[PDB]
Design a protein around this ligand. Structure first.
Ligand SMILES: CC(=O)NCc1cc(-c2cn3c(n2)CCC3)ccc1OCCOCCOCCC(=O)N[C@H](C(=O)N1C[C@H](O)C[C@H]1C(=O)NCc1ccc(-c2scnc2C)cc1)C(C)(C)C
Lengths: 104, 91, 149
């Protein structure tokens, strides 16, 4: 029941897998190991939807079919740092150039 | 365990070392002249390097598997830049 | 004189099911008794057909449009054996895990006429790579040299 994710914040992106049976809290611990900030200092989002820690990834809508190796599902991430949490801000990737005429 | 791959436009992709070591070029860049866990790609923009990281996940998952293998999708708009990247990374 | 990769002319029937477990239109290719590749009717994605074949006959499978290589039971070649019970031999045809480079070539080849390869703004060596289309006869030579070692 493996699920493939892109955890994104600002211009940072983490590629990682996880179980459907694994929880949002267990995902925060994985983020902690990488980005060195504890679970209480991070929020996880699903298109601007605050995910509950106790809920499973499957319950949040991160199914295997929806979150594939070739097309991972996005998880928003926002940190506290100052006092309150910062607003979610996923910086989009660069735009491709115009398709060459020969490829049209 | 993990490494950081940085695009030309400043996007940071954090990926399992094992996955990134799919690329022989990346292996050499990590070893360096003094090793490092970060690599900068001065000619690979974010929309390309993101696709490359997705391919690493794909390759590692579906190699040596009985389960049916889906296509690796490539939009026409990205194909040419991705080919250039793939040529350089040798994966 | 006598190619290593050839069908043997046994006259021992073998019922086979070609099962297309790929998103490609599949071309079945039969190697005749002199090891020459012989095309057969194509299989659309999501389809399978029960086929009359023989023991010791050699098959491989390609994308019908592009001649990209496909796997059959996780290998390149397929050889029907004797039907145990009344069971047909399954030949499950699947995508390989293409390198990223090869997969990019496949997509570029599909969008660009061969005559316009040289109009693309890329290094000369990538032109040569594009022009080196997946070839049945070349893959046989490769498999033949590997067979000895
Ligand atoms: C063609 C011809 O006439 N040549 C024969 C011949 C000539 C001479 C000769 C010399 N000189 C001359 N003539 C003139 C002067 C000098 C000498 C010998 C000679 O014969 C060679 C000896 O071979 C005997 C072979 O015995 C029969 C057993 C055998 O292997 N059958 C083969 C066969 O049936 N096959 C081969 C494969 O296993 C498959 C099967 C097939 O094609 N049919 C089923 C089929 C249909 C559809 C699908 C699909 S694929 C997706 N969808 C569908 C529906 C798949 C399979 C073939 C018919 C292709 C040979």
């Amino acid at each position: 029941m493996d699920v493939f994710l892109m955890i994104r914040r600002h211009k940072t992106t983490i590629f990682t897998d996880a179980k459907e049976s694994s929880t949002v809290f267990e995902l925060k611990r994985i983020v902690e190991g990488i980005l060195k900030r504890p679970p209480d200092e991070q929020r996880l989002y699903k298109d601007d939807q605050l995910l509950d820690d106790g809920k499973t990834l499957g319950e949040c809508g991160f199914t295997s079919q929806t979150a594939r190796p070739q097309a991972p599902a996005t998880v928003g991430l926002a940190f506290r740092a100052d006092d309150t949490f910062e607003a979610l801000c996923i910086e989009p990737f660069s735009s491709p150039p115009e398709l060459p005429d020969v490829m049209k | 365990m993990y490494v950081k791959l940085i695009s030309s436009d400043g996007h940071e992709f954090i990926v399992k070392r094992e996955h990134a070591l799919t690329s022989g070029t990346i292996k050499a860049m990590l070893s360096g002249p003094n090793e490092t866990n970060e690599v900068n790609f001065r000619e690979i923009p974010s929309h390309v390097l993101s696709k490359v990281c997705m391919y690493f996940t794909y390759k590692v998952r579906y190699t040596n598997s009985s389960t049916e293998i889906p296509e690796f999708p490539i939009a026409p708009e990205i194909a040419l830049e991705l080919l250039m990247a793939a040529n350089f990374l040798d994966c | 004189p006598r190619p290593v990769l050839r069908s043997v002319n046994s006259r021992e029937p073998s019922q086979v099911i070609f099962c297309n477990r790929s998103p490609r239109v599949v071309l079945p290719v039969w190697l005749n008794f002199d090891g020459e590749p012989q095309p057969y009717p194509t299989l659309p994605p999501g389809t399978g057909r029960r086929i009359h074949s023989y023991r010791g006959h050699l098959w491989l499978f390609r994308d019908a449009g592009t001649h990209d290589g496909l796997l059959v039971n996780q290998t390149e070649l397929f050889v029907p054996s004797l039907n145990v019970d009344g069971q047909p031999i399954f030949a499950n045809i699947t995508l390989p895990v293409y390198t990223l480079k090869e997969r990019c070539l496949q997509v570029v080849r599909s969008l660009v006429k061969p005559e316009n390869y040289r109009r693309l703004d890329i290094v000369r060596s990538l032109y040569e790579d594009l022009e080196d289309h997946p070839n049945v006869q070349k893959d046989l030579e490769r498999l033949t040299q590997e067979r000895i070692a």
